[PDB]
Design an enzyme around this catalytic site. Sequence first.
Site, PDB file in Angstrom:
ATOM      1  N   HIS A   9      -0.765   6.085   7.629  1.00 42.95           N
ATOM      2  CA  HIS A   9       0.102   6.096   6.453  1.00 42.95           C
ATOM      3  C   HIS A   9      -0.680   6.202   5.151  1.00 42.95           C
ATOM      4  O   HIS A   9      -0.047   6.347   4.094  1.00 42.95           O
ATOM      5  CB  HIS A   9       1.026   4.859   6.410  1.00 42.95           C
ATOM      6  CG  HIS A   9       0.277   3.538   6.125  1.00 42.95           C
ATOM      7  ND1 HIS A   9      -0.054   2.667   7.149  1.00 42.95           N
ATOM      8  CD2 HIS A   9      -0.120   2.995   4.976  1.00 42.95           C
ATOM      9  CE1 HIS A   9      -0.681   1.539   6.634  1.00 42.95           C
ATOM     10  NE2 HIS A   9      -0.724   1.749   5.267  1.00 42.95           N
ATOM     11  N   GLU A  68     -19.332   0.284  -2.761  1.00 38.40           N
ATOM     12  CA  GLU A  68     -18.593  -0.323  -3.870  1.00 38.40           C
ATOM     13  C   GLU A  68     -18.605  -1.850  -3.779  1.00 38.40           C
ATOM     14  O   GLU A  68     -18.031  -2.445  -2.827  1.00 38.40           O
ATOM     15  CB  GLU A  68     -17.117   0.144  -3.881  1.00 38.40           C
ATOM     16  CG  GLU A  68     -16.903   1.615  -4.295  1.00 38.40           C
ATOM     17  CD  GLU A  68     -17.009   1.706  -5.814  1.00 38.40           C
ATOM     18  OE1 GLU A  68     -17.555   0.777  -6.460  1.00 38.40           O
ATOM     19  OE2 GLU A  68     -16.460   2.721  -6.399  1.00 38.40           O
ATOM     20  N   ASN A 126     -17.551  -3.355  -7.080  1.00 33.44           N
ATOM     21  CA  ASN A 126     -16.374  -3.331  -7.970  1.00 33.44           C
ATOM     22  C   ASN A 126     -15.795  -1.940  -8.096  1.00 33.44           C
ATOM     23  O   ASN A 126     -16.529  -1.056  -8.584  1.00 33.44           O
ATOM     24  CB  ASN A 126     -16.810  -3.764  -9.387  1.00 33.44           C
ATOM     25  CG  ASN A 126     -15.612  -3.981 -10.335  1.00 33.44           C
ATOM     26  OD1 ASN A 126     -15.773  -4.857 -11.230  1.00 33.44           O
ATOM     27  ND2 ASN A 126     -14.403  -3.804  -9.828  1.00 33.44           N
ATOM     28  N   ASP A 140      -0.776   4.237  14.112  1.00 36.51           N
ATOM     29  CA  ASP A 140      -1.158   4.262  12.712  1.00 36.51           C
ATOM     30  C   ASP A 140      -2.671   4.334  12.436  1.00 36.51           C
ATOM     31  O   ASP A 140      -3.356   3.320  12.108  1.00 36.51           O
ATOM     32  CB  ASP A 140      -0.456   3.066  12.026  1.00 36.51           C
ATOM     33  CG  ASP A 140      -0.546   3.126  10.503  1.00 36.51           C
ATOM     34  OD1 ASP A 140      -0.811   4.195   9.904  1.00 36.51           O
ATOM     35  OD2 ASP A 140      -0.324   2.085   9.848  1.00 36.51           O
ATOM     36  N   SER A 198      -4.073 -10.309   4.808  1.00 33.18           N
ATOM     37  CA  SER A 198      -4.373  -9.050   4.095  1.00 33.18           C
ATOM     38  C   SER A 198      -3.096  -8.627   3.370  1.00 33.18           C
ATOM     39  O   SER A 198      -2.033  -9.157   3.759  1.00 33.18           O
ATOM     40  CB  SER A 198      -4.840  -7.984   5.122  1.00 33.18           C
ATOM     41  OG  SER A 198      -3.783  -7.840   6.065  1.00 33.18           O
ATOM     42  N   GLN A 206      -1.268  -5.615   0.078  1.00 35.56           N
ATOM     43  CA  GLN A 206      -1.181  -4.229  -0.389  1.00 35.56           C
ATOM     44  C   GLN A 206      -2.446  -3.861  -1.135  1.00 35.56           C
ATOM     45  O   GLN A 206      -3.014  -4.728  -1.843  1.00 35.56           O
ATOM     46  CB  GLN A 206       0.091  -3.998  -1.258  1.00 35.56           C
ATOM     47  CG  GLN A 206       1.334  -3.497  -0.470  1.00 35.56           C
ATOM     48  CD  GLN A 206       1.829  -4.630   0.436  1.00 35.56           C
ATOM     49  OE1 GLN A 206       2.509  -4.380   1.479  1.00 35.56           O
ATOM     50  NE2 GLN A 206       1.919  -5.792  -0.185  1.00 35.56           N
ATOM     51  N   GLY A 207      -3.028  -2.755  -0.685  1.00 28.76           N
ATOM     52  CA  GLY A 207      -4.345  -2.244  -1.076  1.00 28.76           C
ATOM     53  C   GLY A 207      -5.369  -2.384   0.032  1.00 28.76           C
ATOM     54  O   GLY A 207      -6.434  -1.722  -0.032  1.00 28.76           O
ATOM     55  N   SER A 266      -4.580  -1.760   3.369  1.00 31.46           N
ATOM     56  CA  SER A 266      -4.247  -0.774   4.381  1.00 31.46           C
ATOM     57  C   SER A 266      -5.415   0.107   4.778  1.00 31.46           C
ATOM     58  O   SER A 266      -6.119   0.594   3.888  1.00 31.46           O
ATOM     59  CB  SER A 266      -3.127   0.178   3.952  1.00 31.46           C
ATOM     60  OG  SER A 266      -1.904  -0.426   4.386  1.00 31.46           O
ATOM     61  N   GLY A 267      -5.579   0.320   6.048  1.00 27.28           N
ATOM     62  CA  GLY A 267      -6.601   1.223   6.519  1.00 27.28           C
ATOM     63  C   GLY A 267      -7.958   0.567   6.678  1.00 27.28           C
ATOM     64  O   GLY A 267      -8.840   1.198   7.289  1.00 27.28           O
TER      65      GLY A 267
HETATM   66 CA   LIG Z   1     -18.417   0.030  -8.380  1.00 23.94          CA
END
Ligand SMILES: [Ca+2]
Lengths: 225, 56
Positions: free
Chosen positions: A42, A54, A56, A86, A174, A176-177, A179-180
Site C-alpha cells: 500500500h 537518515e 533526521n 501487503d 507502530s 502512521q508513517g 508503514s512498510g
Molecule cells: Ca537527515
Amino acid sequence: DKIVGGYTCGANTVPYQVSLNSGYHFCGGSLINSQWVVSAAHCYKSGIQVRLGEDNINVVEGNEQFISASKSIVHPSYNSNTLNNDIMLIKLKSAASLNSRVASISLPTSCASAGTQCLISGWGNTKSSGTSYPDVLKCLKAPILSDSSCKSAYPGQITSNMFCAGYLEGGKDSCQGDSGGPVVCSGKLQGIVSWGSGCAQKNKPGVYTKVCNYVSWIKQTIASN
Amino acid sequence: TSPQREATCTSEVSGCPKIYNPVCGTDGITYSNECVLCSENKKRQTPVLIQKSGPC
Ligand SMILES: [Ca+2]
C-alpha cells in the site's frame, strides 16, 4: 509518548531502515541488499525517492544517501481491500554504498513463533491531540502474539499472511508513517508494518505482513529483475 | 459544514494502513490519512469533509 511508547534510536542501531519520500516521508522500508528494498504494497507510488542513513528526515546531516527508485514491484495478489499480501519490492537506480548507518537485513529461513520479541522501527510520531506525523526516529521492542489472540482482536480480518505484535494493554505500537518498515526478530526480517485499528489502543495490537511466507518470491523476483 | 470533498473509504478491514498521507479536515484537524478521517467520522453524528490535501 510522542514516539508511541517507543524509545529514540539512531541510524547506526537500525542501519537497514529506509525512508520512502515523494516530497515528504510517507512510508518506511528495509534494505535487503545494496540495490533492493522491501516495503508494504500500500506504499506504492510513482516517483519514490529512497532515503538511506537518515537520523533526521527534516535535516540533511551530510551522511544520508538519496537514491531514486528505478522499479517498484507489488505482489501480484495484493488485495487493497483486505490488505492481504501487503508486500512490495523496490529496485534502486544505483547501488547504495554500505557503511555503519547503511546495511542490509537478512531474510528469514523459518517463521517466528509467538512470544518472540522483535524490534520495530520508524519515523511515526504522535502529537497530543492524537495526531500522527513523521519526525523522530524511534524503536520499539514488541513480542509476536499468538494467531488465536490476533484473530480474536481482529475477527475475520487476519489472513495466513499476517501476524500481530505488541501489547494488549496498549501504550506501545507502530503508527502512521511507520508503514512498510521493519520488524526484526533475532537479526532476521520477520515483519513489515501494515495496519491496525488506531495506534497503541488497548486490545488492538499492530498487524504486520508475515515475511517468511514470501522469501522464495522475494529471492526469485530480485534474481529475475 | 463548509465542505468540498468526501472521504472515499472502502476498507474491508476494521483498521487503517499506517501510511502518512495527510488530509486537511474542514474542522481544521490534520488527518494522517483518509482512512483515519473515515474511522473518526463513523463515530460522529456529523461528518468532517476534506478541505484540502496535505496538512492544514
Ligand atoms: Ca537527515
